Amino acid sequence: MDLLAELQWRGLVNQTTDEDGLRKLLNEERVTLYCGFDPTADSLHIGHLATILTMRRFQQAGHRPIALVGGATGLIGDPSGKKSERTLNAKETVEAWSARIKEQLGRFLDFEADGNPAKIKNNYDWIGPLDVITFLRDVGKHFSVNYMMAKESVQSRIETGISFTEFSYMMLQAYDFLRLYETEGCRLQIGGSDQWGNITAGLELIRKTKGRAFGLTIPLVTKADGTKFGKTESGTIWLDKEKTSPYEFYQFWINTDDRDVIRYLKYFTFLSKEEIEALEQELREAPEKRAAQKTLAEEVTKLVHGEEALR
Amino acid sequence: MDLLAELQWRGLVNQTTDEDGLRKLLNEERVTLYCGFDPTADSLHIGHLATILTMRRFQQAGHRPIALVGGATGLIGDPSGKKSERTLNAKETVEAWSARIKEQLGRFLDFEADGNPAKIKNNYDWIGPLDVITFLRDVGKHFSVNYMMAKESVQSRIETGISFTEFSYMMLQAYDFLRLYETEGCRLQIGGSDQWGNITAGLELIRKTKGRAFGLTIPLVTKADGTKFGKTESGTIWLDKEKTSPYEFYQFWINTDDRDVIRYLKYFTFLSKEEIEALEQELREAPEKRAAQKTLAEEVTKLVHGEEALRQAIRYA
Ligand SMILES: N[C@@H](Cc1ccc(O)cc1)C(=O)O
Ligand SMILES: N[C@@H](Cc1ccc(O)cc1)C(=O)O
């Protein structure tokens, strides 16, 4: 309501399944939400921040976040937002990564709060042991191939080609949505824009199987200059302080372009509406000063690296 | 070689991937083949005979038949030859059906032979335990959505609607082919016409997985009147002498359409060209003796039920 509006003011809402319905749920109850992360590398990078930070905004508003590490789905591969078929990673490799990603995630959430402690989950737990028979009958039966073919992630690759492995991926994330709803009271799933189709599939699964849940997507981070975000010439800014140092990390933020800066304060910091506007005024009135950028860099660096790393 | 030539002669060959290549293995080796049967009911019916009597003709030629009972594919359902989506049977049921279907295959094959005893298998054994992830990584990666989409069982239902469940069936029958190939030297798979799609998917798996194997299908059983083969007023003709009695059974056969009779002698009996021809002359030459239909009925009744039963059916009839 006020959280949804704020998110909205912050430009963190791309699409929602039912705005009026979610907003009433948010204002009424303590909502249990989830967002999943597939280990595709040994580190999360700045492109995952928006989604994590948003999970934390919800925790600050009193909701209960569940970050999910795709220990199983990571072995399959999401065609979502990918232009070509991907090579399969080794279980041993995906396993190692999971562990690393599980650690990063945990820096952003509160596992001790009362009322809404966070949780970190790995879908390997419930998919790892799923046999083919049960999957096909219990999940598979509820989806038509048509339904499936019309999803962007598949519709996008039909000229290129897609494997049955990657085409099936959405049933898996559909299943995670259903499990978490069943065991955890989860009624909201968040994700990046390309996740829309996987999100609406999970929802269709609960609906055909039960009879009460929502989806919301976060817009991709944009560069006013029309460039690509997190794209340096030292490559990727990782949240792994040994791949990308605090220095390096902090320097990245400080060099944020004036045209981008405020948008970035809104997406990435926990500053108030009122605080951000000040900064806006100061950029107008005294940009040589570069106050907005300096705040951004300290705020983000603290969040990702801690106060010590800030020093 | 000769077995092909005679299958061909009996009109039992509808399609084969590589005749030339197959005729060569048959003539050159003792081929291990398989045919699958899904328990969609407690008993097999006469729609099942052509494939079962063919397995038997192979075994007679000296190859080794493997009949697989669809312990696990029976729980998924094959869209092939079905114009709509089926209801999922329940495990306990399907399993009840498999035990029963396992006993009927057993009478058409020789487990005793020298060189090629028949074997009966149940795919629940390798699929019951398969996990989603191995399934999807190890099998799935090999198949494009395009390849699956061009199948007739799918193309045919894109209108009426097909679940991902029935969509995926072909991966399981393709996996059976591979499994048998690896563990039993199975190089040939047969089935009725509608299995053509499922048979070729099996060979793609193997080819994409190994780098050797064949498929053959038998034509669908027809009636010169264009009505449905094996459909009574009573329903279906079962192979279970407790669903359909020997008498009921026998009667079904003596009653074949004159037009249908020689064709059926070819598909359903172990008589010779020579003999078949005879009965054919008899029928042009004296069709009221109903010569043909009698042999047929006697022949199929003995195969399915034994002479004691034939004795009896001949009696109360
Ligand atoms: N598929 C998503 C992550 C994800 C994994 C599992 C889930 O249940 C939900 C989301 C991605 O590729 O980023
Ligand atoms: N699908 C076949 C039976 C079958 C099952 C498993 C196989 O591996 C092969 C064939 C049918 O419906 O008759």
UniProtKB/Swiss-Prot annotation, chain A:
Changing Q195A: Destabilizes the transition state for the first step of the reaction, but does not affect the transition state for the second step. Its EC number is 6.1.1.1. Changing K228A: Decreases the binding affinity between tRNA(Tyr) and TyrRS-Tyr-AMP complex. Transmembrane segments: none annotated. Changing K82A: Destabilizes the transition states for both steps of the reaction. A motif ('HIGH' region) lies at residues 39-48. It comes from the Bacteria. L-tyrosine binds at Y34, Y169, Q173, D176. A motif ('KMSKS' region) lies at residues 228-232. It catalyses: tRNA(Tyr) + L-tyrosine + ATP = L-tyrosyl-tRNA(Tyr) + AMP + diphosphate + H(+). Changing H48A: Does not affect the second step of the reaction. Its main location: cytoplasm. It is found in: Cytoplasm. One of its GO terms (biological process) is regulation of protein complex stability. Keywords: Aminoacyl-tRNA synthetase, ATP-binding, Cytoplasm, Ligase, Nucleotide-binding, Protein biosynthesis, RNA-binding, tRNA-binding. GO terms for molecular function: ATP binding; protein homodimerization activity; tRNA binding; tyrosine-tRNA ligase activity. Homodimer. Belongs to the class-I aminoacyl-tRNA synthetase family. TyrS type 1 subfamily. This is Tyrosine--tRNA ligase. It comes from Geobacillus stearothermophilus (Bacillus stearothermophilus).
